[PDB]
Coordinates of C-alpha atoms and ligand atoms in Angstrom, one line a residue:
Chain A
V68 CA 102.0 72.1 163.8
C69 CA 104.2 72.0 166.8
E70 CA 107.9 71.0 166.5
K71 CA 107.5 67.4 167.3
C72 CA 104.7 66.8 165.0
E73 CA 106.5 68.0 161.9
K74 CA 107.6 64.6 161.0
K75 CA 104.0 63.8 160.5
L76 CA 103.6 66.4 157.8
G77 CA 103.3 65.6 154.2
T78 CA 105.6 67.0 151.6
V79 CA 105.1 68.7 148.2
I80 CA 106.3 66.6 145.3
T81 CA 108.5 69.4 143.8
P82 CA 111.5 70.5 145.8
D83 CA 111.5 73.7 147.8
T84 CA 113.5 76.6 146.4
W85 CA 114.7 77.8 149.7
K86 CA 116.9 74.8 150.4
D87 CA 117.7 75.3 154.1
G88 CA 115.5 73.6 156.5
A89 CA 113.5 71.9 153.8
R90 CA 112.0 68.5 154.1
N91 CA 111.6 67.7 150.4
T92 CA 115.0 68.2 149.0
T93 CA 117.5 65.5 148.0
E94 CA 120.1 66.7 150.6
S95 CA 117.5 66.7 153.4
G96 CA 116.8 63.1 152.6
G97 CA 113.1 63.6 152.4
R98 CA 113.2 63.3 148.6
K99 CA 114.7 59.8 148.2
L100 CA 116.1 58.3 145.1
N101 CA 114.3 55.3 143.5
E102 CA 111.1 56.0 145.2
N103 CA 108.3 53.6 144.5
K104 CA 105.1 55.6 144.7
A105 CA 102.9 52.7 145.5
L106 CA 104.9 51.9 148.6
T107 CA 105.0 55.4 150.0
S108 CA 101.4 56.2 149.0
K109 CA 99.6 55.8 152.3
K110 CA 102.2 57.8 154.1
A111 CA 100.8 61.1 155.3
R112 CA 97.7 60.7 153.2
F113 CA 94.2 59.7 154.0
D114 CA 93.4 56.0 154.2
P115 CA 90.0 55.0 155.4
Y116 CA 91.1 51.4 156.0
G117 CA 94.6 52.4 157.2
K118 CA 95.7 54.3 160.1
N119 CA 94.8 57.9 158.9
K120 CA 91.0 57.7 158.5
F121 CA 88.8 60.7 157.7
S122 CA 88.6 62.6 161.0
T123 CA 86.5 65.4 162.3
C124 CA 87.4 68.1 164.8
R125 CA 87.0 67.1 168.4
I126 CA 85.4 70.4 169.1
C127 CA 83.2 71.4 166.2
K128 CA 82.8 68.0 164.5
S129 CA 83.6 69.3 161.0
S130 CA 86.0 67.4 158.9
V131 CA 89.7 68.1 159.0
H132 CA 91.7 68.4 155.8
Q133 CA 95.1 67.1 157.0
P134 CA 95.8 63.5 157.8
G135 CA 96.3 62.8 161.5
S136 CA 94.8 66.1 162.7
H137 CA 92.3 66.1 165.5
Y138 CA 91.5 69.8 165.3
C139 CA 90.2 71.7 162.3
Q140 CA 92.1 74.9 161.2
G141 CA 89.7 77.4 162.8
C142 CA 89.5 75.7 166.2
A143 CA 93.3 75.2 166.3
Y144 CA 93.9 78.9 165.4
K145 CA 91.4 80.1 168.0
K146 CA 92.6 78.0 170.9
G147 CA 96.3 78.4 170.0
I148 CA 97.2 74.8 169.7
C149 CA 98.8 72.2 167.5
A150 CA 96.3 70.7 165.1
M151 CA 97.7 67.2 165.6
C152 CA 98.4 66.9 169.3
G153 CA 96.7 69.8 170.9
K154 CA 99.7 71.2 172.7
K155 CA 99.6 74.9 172.7
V156 CA 102.0 76.8 170.5
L157 CA 100.8 80.3 171.2
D158 CA 99.8 82.3 174.3
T159 CA 96.5 83.9 173.4
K160 CA 95.6 85.7 176.6
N161 CA 96.3 89.1 174.9
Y162 CA 95.2 88.2 171.4
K163 CA 91.6 88.8 170.4
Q164 CA 91.7 86.2 167.6
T165 CA 89.6 87.4 164.8
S166 CA 88.2 84.8 162.4
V167 CA 87.6 87.6 160.0
Chain B
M178 CA 137.9 78.7 132.2
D179 CA 141.1 78.8 130.3
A180 CA 139.4 78.7 126.9
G181 CA 135.6 78.6 126.6
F182 CA 134.0 75.4 127.1
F183 CA 132.2 75.6 123.8
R184 CA 134.4 74.8 120.9
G185 CA 132.0 73.7 118.2
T186 CA 130.7 70.2 117.7
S187 CA 132.7 67.3 116.3
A188 CA 131.5 65.3 113.4
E189 CA 130.7 62.3 115.7
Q190 CA 128.3 64.4 117.6
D191 CA 126.5 66.4 115.0
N192 CA 124.0 64.8 112.8
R193 CA 123.1 67.9 110.8
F194 CA 125.9 67.4 108.4
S195 CA 126.6 64.4 106.2
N196 CA 130.0 62.6 106.0
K197 CA 131.8 64.4 103.3
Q198 CA 134.6 61.8 103.1
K199 CA 132.2 59.0 102.4
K200 CA 130.3 61.1 99.9
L201 CA 133.4 61.9 98.0
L202 CA 134.4 58.2 98.0
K203 CA 131.2 57.6 96.2
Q204 CA 131.2 60.3 93.6
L205 CA 134.8 61.0 92.5
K206 CA 136.0 58.8 89.6
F207 CA 139.1 57.1 90.8
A208 CA 141.9 55.6 88.7
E209 CA 141.7 52.0 87.6
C210 CA 144.4 50.4 89.8
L211 CA 144.2 51.9 93.2
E212 CA 142.5 48.9 94.9
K213 CA 145.7 46.9 95.0
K214 CA 147.1 46.9 98.5
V215 CA 150.6 48.4 99.1
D216 CA 153.0 47.5 101.8
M217 CA 155.4 50.4 102.4
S218 CA 158.0 48.4 104.3
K219 CA 158.7 46.6 101.0
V220 CA 159.1 50.0 99.2
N221 CA 162.2 52.2 99.1
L222 CA 161.0 55.7 99.5
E223 CA 163.8 58.2 99.0
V224 CA 164.3 56.9 95.5
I225 CA 160.6 57.5 94.9
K226 CA 160.8 61.1 96.2
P227 CA 162.7 63.0 93.3
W228 CA 160.2 61.8 90.8
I229 CA 157.3 63.1 92.9
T230 CA 159.0 66.4 93.5
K231 CA 159.6 66.8 89.8
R232 CA 156.0 65.6 88.9
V233 CA 154.3 68.0 91.4
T234 CA 156.7 70.8 90.4
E235 CA 155.7 70.6 86.7
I236 CA 152.0 70.1 87.4
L237 CA 151.9 73.1 89.8
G238 CA 154.0 75.5 87.6
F239 CA 156.1 76.3 90.7
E240 CA 157.3 74.3 93.7
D241 CA 155.2 73.9 96.9
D242 CA 157.0 72.1 99.6
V243 CA 153.9 71.8 101.6
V244 CA 152.2 69.9 98.9
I245 CA 155.4 67.8 98.4
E246 CA 155.8 66.9 102.1
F247 CA 152.1 66.4 102.5
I248 CA 152.3 63.7 99.8
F249 CA 155.3 62.2 101.4
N250 CA 153.7 62.2 104.8
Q251 CA 150.7 60.3 103.6
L252 CA 153.1 57.6 102.3
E253 CA 154.7 57.0 105.7
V254 CA 152.0 54.6 107.1
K255 CA 152.3 50.9 106.4
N256 CA 149.2 50.6 104.2
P257 CA 148.6 54.0 102.5
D258 CA 145.0 54.7 101.5
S259 CA 145.1 55.6 97.9
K260 CA 141.6 56.9 97.5
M261 CA 141.9 59.3 100.4
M262 CA 145.2 60.5 98.9
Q263 CA 143.5 61.3 95.6
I264 CA 140.8 63.2 97.4
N265 CA 143.2 65.1 99.6
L266 CA 145.2 66.1 96.5
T267 CA 142.2 67.1 94.4
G268 CA 142.0 70.5 96.1
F269 CA 145.5 71.5 95.2
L270 CA 145.9 70.0 91.8
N271 CA 143.0 70.0 89.3
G272 CA 141.3 66.9 90.3
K273 CA 142.1 65.8 86.8
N274 CA 145.8 66.2 87.6
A275 CA 145.2 64.3 90.9
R276 CA 143.7 61.4 89.1
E277 CA 146.6 61.1 86.6
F278 CA 149.1 61.7 89.4
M279 CA 147.8 58.7 91.4
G280 CA 147.4 56.8 88.2
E281 CA 151.2 56.9 87.8
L282 CA 152.4 57.0 91.4
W283 CA 150.4 54.0 92.4
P284 CA 151.5 51.3 89.8
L285 CA 155.0 52.6 90.4
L286 CA 154.7 51.7 94.1
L287 CA 153.2 48.3 93.1
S288 CA 156.3 47.7 90.9
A289 CA 158.5 48.7 93.8
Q290 CA 157.0 46.2 96.2
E291 CA 157.2 43.4 93.7
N292 CA 160.9 44.0 93.5
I293 CA 163.2 42.6 96.2
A294 CA 165.4 45.7 96.2
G295 CA 162.5 48.1 96.9
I296 CA 163.0 49.9 93.5
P297 CA 160.4 49.9 90.8
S298 CA 161.0 48.7 87.3
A299 CA 161.4 52.0 85.4
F300 CA 163.9 53.1 88.0
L301 CA 165.9 49.9 87.8
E302 CA 166.1 50.5 84.0
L303 CA 167.4 54.0 84.4
Chain C
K32 CA 142.4 94.9 114.3
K33 CA 141.8 97.5 111.5
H34 CA 143.5 95.1 109.2
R35 CA 140.2 93.2 108.7
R36 CA 138.8 96.3 107.0
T37 CA 141.6 96.2 104.4
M38 CA 140.6 92.8 103.1
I39 CA 138.2 92.8 100.2
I40 CA 136.1 90.1 98.7
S41 CA 138.0 88.1 96.1
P42 CA 136.7 87.2 92.7
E43 CA 135.1 84.0 91.8
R44 CA 136.9 80.9 93.0
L45 CA 136.6 77.4 91.5
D46 CA 135.5 74.2 93.2
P47 CA 137.6 71.2 92.2
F48 CA 135.2 68.6 93.5
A49 CA 132.2 70.0 91.7
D50 CA 130.7 67.5 89.3
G51 CA 132.7 64.5 90.4
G52 CA 136.0 66.3 89.9
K53 CA 135.5 66.8 86.2
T54 CA 138.0 68.1 83.7
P55 CA 138.0 71.9 84.3
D56 CA 136.4 73.9 81.6
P57 CA 138.8 76.3 79.9
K58 CA 138.0 80.0 79.8
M59 CA 136.0 79.9 83.0
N60 CA 137.9 82.7 84.7
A61 CA 137.5 81.0 88.1
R62 CA 140.7 81.1 90.2
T63 CA 142.1 77.7 91.0
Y64 CA 144.7 77.0 93.7
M65 CA 147.7 77.7 91.5
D66 CA 146.2 81.1 90.4
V67 CA 145.9 82.0 94.1
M68 CA 149.4 81.0 94.9
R69 CA 150.7 82.9 91.9
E70 CA 148.9 86.1 93.0
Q71 CA 150.2 85.7 96.6
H72 CA 153.8 85.2 95.5
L73 CA 153.5 88.0 93.1
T74 CA 152.3 90.6 95.6
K75 CA 155.1 89.5 98.1
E76 CA 157.5 90.1 95.3
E77 CA 156.0 93.5 94.4
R78 CA 156.2 94.7 97.9
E79 CA 159.9 93.6 98.1
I80 CA 160.4 95.7 95.0
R81 CA 158.8 98.8 96.4
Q82 CA 160.7 98.3 99.7
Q83 CA 163.9 98.2 97.6
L84 CA 163.0 101.2 95.5
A85 CA 162.0 103.1 98.6
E86 CA 165.5 103.2 100.0
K87 CA 167.1 104.4 96.8
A88 CA 165.1 107.6 96.6
Chain D
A46 CA 117.2 70.5 126.5
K47 CA 113.8 69.3 125.4
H48 CA 112.8 72.9 124.8
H49 CA 115.6 73.8 122.5
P50 CA 116.0 71.7 119.3
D51 CA 119.3 73.1 118.4
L52 CA 121.1 72.0 121.5
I53 CA 123.4 69.0 121.3
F54 CA 124.6 66.5 123.8
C55 CA 128.2 65.3 124.1
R56 CA 127.4 61.6 124.2
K57 CA 130.9 60.3 124.6
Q58 CA 131.6 57.4 126.8
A59 CA 130.8 58.5 130.3
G60 CA 133.3 58.0 133.1
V61 CA 133.7 58.4 136.8
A62 CA 133.1 62.1 136.9
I63 CA 129.8 63.1 138.5
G64 CA 127.9 65.8 136.7
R65 CA 126.7 68.8 138.7
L66 CA 124.0 71.5 138.5
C67 CA 124.1 75.2 139.3
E68 CA 121.5 76.8 141.5
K69 CA 119.3 77.7 138.6
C70 CA 119.2 74.1 137.4
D71 CA 119.0 72.5 140.8
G72 CA 116.4 69.7 141.1
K73 CA 115.7 69.1 137.4
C74 CA 116.5 66.2 135.1
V75 CA 119.2 66.6 132.5
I76 CA 117.4 64.8 129.7
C77 CA 113.6 65.4 129.8
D78 CA 114.0 68.4 132.2
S79 CA 111.5 67.4 134.9
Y80 CA 111.4 68.3 138.6
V81 CA 110.1 65.1 140.1
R82 CA 111.3 61.7 141.1
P83 CA 115.1 61.5 140.8
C84 CA 116.4 58.0 140.1
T85 CA 120.1 57.9 139.1
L86 CA 123.3 59.9 139.3
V87 CA 124.7 61.5 136.2
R88 CA 128.2 60.7 135.0
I89 CA 130.1 62.8 132.6
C90 CA 132.9 61.9 130.2
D91 CA 136.6 62.8 130.9
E92 CA 136.9 65.7 128.5
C93 CA 133.9 67.4 129.9
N94 CA 135.4 67.7 133.3
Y95 CA 138.8 68.7 132.0
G96 CA 140.7 71.3 133.9
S97 CA 138.9 74.5 134.9
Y98 CA 135.6 73.0 133.8
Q99 CA 135.7 70.4 136.6
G100 CA 132.5 70.9 138.5
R101 CA 130.5 73.2 136.3
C102 CA 126.8 72.8 135.4
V103 CA 125.9 70.0 133.0
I104 CA 122.8 71.7 131.5
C105 CA 123.9 75.4 131.3
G106 CA 127.5 75.5 132.4
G107 CA 127.5 77.7 135.5
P108 CA 129.2 77.0 138.9
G109 CA 127.7 73.7 140.0
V110 CA 126.1 73.5 143.4
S111 CA 124.5 70.0 143.6
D112 CA 124.6 66.6 141.9
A113 CA 122.6 65.9 138.8
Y114 CA 120.3 63.0 138.5
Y115 CA 118.2 61.4 135.8
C116 CA 114.5 61.0 136.7
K117 CA 112.7 57.7 137.0
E118 CA 111.1 57.9 133.5
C119 CA 114.4 58.4 131.8
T120 CA 115.8 55.5 133.7
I121 CA 112.9 53.2 132.7
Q122 CA 113.3 54.2 129.1
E123 CA 117.1 53.8 129.5
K124 CA 117.8 57.3 128.4
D125 CA 120.5 57.3 131.1
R126 CA 122.6 55.0 128.9
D127 CA 123.1 57.2 125.8
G128 CA 126.3 58.9 126.9
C129 CA 127.6 62.1 128.4
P130 CA 124.7 64.4 128.7
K131 CA 126.7 67.6 128.8
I132 CA 125.4 70.2 126.4
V133 CA 128.2 71.2 124.1
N134 CA 126.8 74.3 122.3
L135 CA 125.2 77.4 123.6
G136 CA 122.6 77.6 120.9
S137 CA 120.7 80.5 119.4
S138 CA 118.5 81.4 122.4
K139 CA 121.4 82.1 124.8
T140 CA 123.4 84.2 122.2
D141 CA 120.4 86.3 121.2
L142 CA 119.6 87.1 124.9
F143 CA 123.2 88.4 125.3
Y144 CA 123.2 90.7 122.3
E145 CA 119.7 92.0 123.2
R146 CA 120.6 93.0 126.7
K147 CA 123.9 94.4 125.6
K148 CA 122.1 96.5 122.9
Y149 CA 119.8 97.9 125.6
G150 CA 122.2 98.1 128.6
Chain E
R235 CA 143.8 113.6 111.2
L236 CA 141.5 111.5 109.0
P237 CA 139.2 108.5 109.7
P238 CA 140.2 105.2 108.0
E239 CA 137.0 105.0 105.8
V240 CA 137.8 108.0 103.7
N241 CA 138.3 107.1 100.0
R242 CA 139.2 108.7 96.7
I243 CA 135.9 107.4 95.2
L244 CA 132.6 109.2 95.8
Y245 CA 129.2 107.9 95.2
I246 CA 126.5 110.4 94.1
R247 CA 122.8 110.2 94.5
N248 CA 120.0 112.5 93.1
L249 CA 121.8 113.3 89.9
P250 CA 119.4 114.8 87.3
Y251 CA 119.2 112.7 84.2
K252 CA 121.1 113.4 81.0
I253 CA 123.3 116.0 82.6
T254 CA 126.3 116.8 80.4
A255 CA 129.8 115.5 80.8
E256 CA 131.2 119.0 80.9
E257 CA 128.9 120.2 83.6
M258 CA 129.8 117.1 85.7
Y259 CA 133.5 117.6 85.4
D260 CA 133.1 121.3 86.1
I261 CA 131.1 120.6 89.3
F262 CA 133.5 118.0 90.6
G263 CA 136.8 119.3 89.3
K264 CA 136.9 122.2 91.6
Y265 CA 138.2 120.3 94.6
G266 CA 141.0 118.6 92.6
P267 CA 142.0 116.7 89.5
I268 CA 139.7 113.9 88.6
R269 CA 141.0 110.4 87.9
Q270 CA 137.7 109.0 86.4
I271 CA 133.9 109.4 86.4
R272 CA 131.4 106.6 85.8
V273 CA 127.7 107.3 85.2
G274 CA 124.9 104.7 85.5
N275 CA 123.4 103.5 82.2
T276 CA 121.1 100.7 83.4
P277 CA 117.7 102.1 84.4
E278 CA 117.9 100.7 88.0
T279 CA 121.2 102.6 88.4
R280 CA 120.4 105.5 86.1
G281 CA 120.9 108.9 87.7
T282 CA 123.8 108.2 90.1
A283 CA 127.5 108.5 89.7
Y284 CA 131.0 107.4 90.9
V285 CA 133.8 110.0 90.9
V286 CA 137.4 109.1 91.5
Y287 CA 139.7 111.8 92.6
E288 CA 143.4 111.7 92.0
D289 CA 144.0 113.0 95.5
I290 CA 142.5 111.6 98.7
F291 CA 142.4 115.0 100.4
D292 CA 140.4 116.5 97.6
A293 CA 137.9 113.7 97.8
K294 CA 137.8 114.3 101.6
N295 CA 137.1 118.0 100.9
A296 CA 134.5 117.3 98.2
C297 CA 132.5 115.1 100.5
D298 CA 132.9 117.6 103.3
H299 CA 131.6 120.6 101.2
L300 CA 129.8 119.0 98.2
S301 CA 127.0 117.3 100.2
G302 CA 123.5 119.0 99.9
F303 CA 124.6 121.0 96.9
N304 CA 121.7 122.2 94.6
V305 CA 122.1 121.1 91.0
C306 CA 119.1 121.2 88.7
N307 CA 116.8 122.1 91.6
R308 CA 117.7 119.1 93.7
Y309 CA 120.0 118.4 96.7
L310 CA 123.1 116.3 95.9
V311 CA 123.8 113.3 98.1
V312 CA 127.4 112.4 98.2
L313 CA 129.0 109.6 100.2
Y314 CA 132.2 107.6 100.2
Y315 CA 132.1 104.5 98.1
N316 CA 133.3 101.5 100.0
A317 CA 135.4 99.5 97.6
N318 CA 134.8 96.3 99.4
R319 CA 135.1 93.7 96.6
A320 CA 137.0 92.9 93.4
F321 CA 135.2 92.1 90.2
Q322 CA 138.0 90.5 88.2
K323 CA 141.1 88.4 88.5
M324 CA 144.3 90.3 88.7
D325 CA 145.9 88.9 85.5
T326 CA 149.2 87.5 86.8
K327 CA 150.9 87.5 83.4
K328 CA 150.7 91.2 82.9
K329 CA 151.7 91.9 86.5
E330 CA 154.6 89.5 86.1
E331 CA 155.9 91.2 83.0
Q332 CA 155.5 94.6 84.6
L333 CA 157.5 93.5 87.6
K334 CA 160.1 91.9 85.4
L335 CA 160.5 95.2 83.5
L336 CA 160.8 97.2 86.7
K337 CA 163.3 94.8 88.3
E338 CA 165.2 94.7 85.0
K339 CA 165.2 98.5 84.9
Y340 CA 166.7 99.2 88.3
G341 CA 168.7 96.0 88.9
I342 CA 166.9 95.2 92.1
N343 CA 167.2 91.5 92.6
Chain F
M105 CA 114.3 68.9 99.4
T106 CA 116.5 70.3 102.0
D107 CA 114.3 68.6 104.6
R108 CA 114.9 65.4 102.6
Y109 CA 118.6 66.0 102.8
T110 CA 118.6 66.7 106.5
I111 CA 116.6 63.6 107.2
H112 CA 119.2 61.8 105.1
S113 CA 122.1 63.0 107.1
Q114 CA 120.4 62.3 110.4
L115 CA 119.6 58.8 109.5
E116 CA 123.1 58.0 108.3
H117 CA 124.4 59.4 111.5
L118 CA 122.1 56.9 113.4
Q119 CA 123.0 54.0 111.2
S120 CA 126.7 54.5 111.9
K121 CA 126.0 54.7 115.6
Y122 CA 123.5 51.8 116.0
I123 CA 124.2 49.4 113.2
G124 CA 120.9 48.3 111.8
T125 CA 118.5 51.2 111.8
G126 CA 116.8 51.8 108.6
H127 CA 115.7 54.7 106.6
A128 CA 113.1 55.3 103.9
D129 CA 115.2 53.5 101.3
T130 CA 116.2 50.3 103.1
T131 CA 116.1 47.4 100.7
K132 CA 114.8 44.0 101.7
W133 CA 118.2 42.5 101.7
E134 CA 119.6 45.1 104.2
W135 CA 116.8 44.7 106.7
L136 CA 117.0 41.0 106.7
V137 CA 120.8 40.8 107.0
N138 CA 120.5 43.0 110.0
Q139 CA 117.9 40.9 111.7
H140 CA 119.9 37.7 110.9
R141 CA 123.0 39.1 112.5
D142 CA 121.1 40.3 115.5
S143 CA 119.6 36.9 115.8
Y144 CA 122.9 35.2 115.8
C145 CA 124.3 37.5 118.5
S146 CA 121.2 36.8 120.6
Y147 CA 121.6 33.1 120.2
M148 CA 125.2 33.3 121.3
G149 CA 124.2 35.4 124.3
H150 CA 121.3 33.4 125.8
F151 CA 122.5 30.1 127.2
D152 CA 119.3 28.1 126.7
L153 CA 118.6 29.0 123.1
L154 CA 122.2 27.8 122.5
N155 CA 121.5 24.6 124.5
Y156 CA 118.4 23.9 122.4
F157 CA 120.2 24.3 119.2
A158 CA 123.0 22.2 120.4
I159 CA 120.6 19.4 121.3
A160 CA 118.4 19.6 118.3
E161 CA 121.5 19.2 116.1
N162 CA 123.6 16.6 117.8
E163 CA 126.6 19.0 118.2
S164 CA 128.6 20.4 121.0
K165 CA 128.1 24.0 122.0
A166 CA 131.5 25.1 120.9
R167 CA 130.9 23.8 117.4
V168 CA 127.5 25.5 117.5
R169 CA 129.0 28.9 118.5
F170 CA 131.7 28.6 115.9
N171 CA 129.2 27.8 113.1
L172 CA 127.1 30.8 114.1
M173 CA 130.1 33.0 114.0
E174 CA 130.9 31.7 110.5
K175 CA 127.4 32.5 109.3
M176 CA 127.7 36.2 110.4
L177 CA 129.7 37.1 107.3
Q178 CA 127.1 36.5 104.7
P179 CA 124.0 35.4 106.5
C180 CA 121.5 35.8 103.7
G181 CA 123.5 35.3 100.5
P182 CA 125.4 37.8 98.4
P183 CA 124.2 41.4 98.1
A184 CA 121.5 41.7 95.6
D185 CA 122.9 44.3 93.3
Ligands
ZN147 ZN1 86.9 72.6 164.8
ZN148 ZN1 101.9 68.7 167.9
ZN149 ZN1 122.9 75.3 135.3
ZN150 ZN1 114.0 62.7 132.8
ZN151 ZN1 131.3 64.8 127.5

C-alpha cells in the first residue's frame, strides 16, 4: 500500500523478528497489553454489516482479499497503484509488467 | 557475573528431596525427658562447661574442640532445641552415645534452672 | 591440581543414622567418626616424624 | 520452561525489580512460553537482580534487551502470582549442548 | 622425566594358564627385584597377574619393553595398575605402636 | 517405589507451602480440619456472612469474630489417633 494507507493494514498476531519499523511489537505500541480480542475483532478484518464489507475490484470486478481495498492484487500491480486508495506508487512507463 | 548465577537450589525451592530434619525427628528414638522446656537465662553456663568437656573427651577417646564448642554454641539461644541437638551430635558420637549424652545433659540443665543460683543439684553437692 | 589424583577411595564408612540410630554392631569394620579422626591425626604425626628424621640424616 | 521438566523457578517473594528478556527470548511468556497476547509485567525477587545479575534474562540468563510479560492466559489462571519466575538451574539440556559442541569444536 | 601415572605395580593380561611360579619370576625379574606377585585364582580373573616391583624405574622399564612379549605362543599385555582404592582400614593401633617405637627410638618428640 | 517416594516428597513440599493440600493418604480428620479452618477464615473475611451470623445469633460482630478465632484451634475435636 502507499505510505498513508499503512495504518489501515492488519497485523500478524505474532511479533516480528526484525524489530525496527515493526507494527506488531510491544515497543511499537501496535501490540497492546490487556487486549480484549472481541473489542478489536472488527478492526482491519471483513465485516459485512460493518464498515469493511466484501469488496470487488473496481476494474475487473473480482473479489479482493484485503479489507478496505478497492483494487485486486493483479490490477494494482499492473497499473502501479495503491490497492486501497489508488494513488500511484510506481512509474510504469518503462516496465513491461508481466503477470507471468 | 562475579560468581555464576547458578548456585544450586535451596530446600525451599526444590521438591525433589524430602525434609531430612523432619524425617529424623520421626525415626530417631530420643531420650525420655527432652520435652521439658529450658530457659537458659536461668542457667549458669560456665559451671556446666567442664563436665561437658570431660564427658565428650572420654566418649571420643581424644579431645575435639570443634565438637565441644559446637555443643556450647547450641546452648547459647534462650530456648535450646534438644531434639535437634541430639540429631546434630549423632554424626560425631555413636548415636547411642548421643542419646545417653543428651539424657544426662538435659536433666542437669533442668536441675540448673530450678535452682535460684543457676547451678544444678549434683554440682551444688560437690 | 594433580593432588586430586593422589586421593584414593576410602574403605567402608558407617552411617550413624541408619536404622533409627541403633546401637552399632561390634566387629562391623566400618569406620566411624572417631576412627577417621584417629587416622588423620596419626598421619599428621607420621609426617612430622619423617620430617624430623629427614634432617638428622 | 514448559519444555524442560527439570528446570526450577525461584519462587521467592517478588519485588520491585522488573524482569527482562534477551533477544532470543524476546516476545515470549515466562511461564507457559507463548508468543501471543501479553497481559502483565514480570517482577523478580531482590536476590535475582543482585549485583552483576541486574538486568539479565529471566528465562535463560543472557543480556536482557526488553521487558518480560506474562500472557493473558497465565494472568487469568493467576499463574502470575506464584513468585519470582527466574529459572535457577541450567538443567541437563544446556549442559549437554556445551560438552557436545566442545567435544566437536 | 616421568609421567605421574607410572606405578610399581603392573597388571598383566593374556597369561597362559597354570604357568609356573619360577617361570613367572624369571620373566619379570630381569628388570629389577620383585616385591610381590599375585595370580588370579577365581575363574573370572583366572589368567592375569599383578606384579609389584621394588623399584619404580624398573617397573617403568618393564612396561616400556615387556609389552607384546611372546610367552606360550601369545602376546603379553602389560599395563600400569591404578591403585585407586583401599580395601581395608589402616589399623590405627598397629600404626600407633609402630610410631611410638620409632619416636621412642630416636627421641623425636 | 522410587516414583512413590518422589510423589511423596513433592506432596509434602506442596503441603508446607499451601496448607491444606492432600495426598493419597489424607485421613478424614485432616481433610475436614482444613476445610473447617478455611471456612472460618472465609467467614471472617466476607462482611455479609459475618453479618448474617451476627444476626442469627444475637451477638455483636466482635464477639462473633472472637469466637471463630477461638474455634480455629481444634475445630473438629481432638486428633483421631
Ligand atoms: Zn482487478
Ligand atoms: Zn494508499
Ligand atoms: Zn533469554
Ligand atoms: Zn503464559
Ligand atoms: Zn528470585
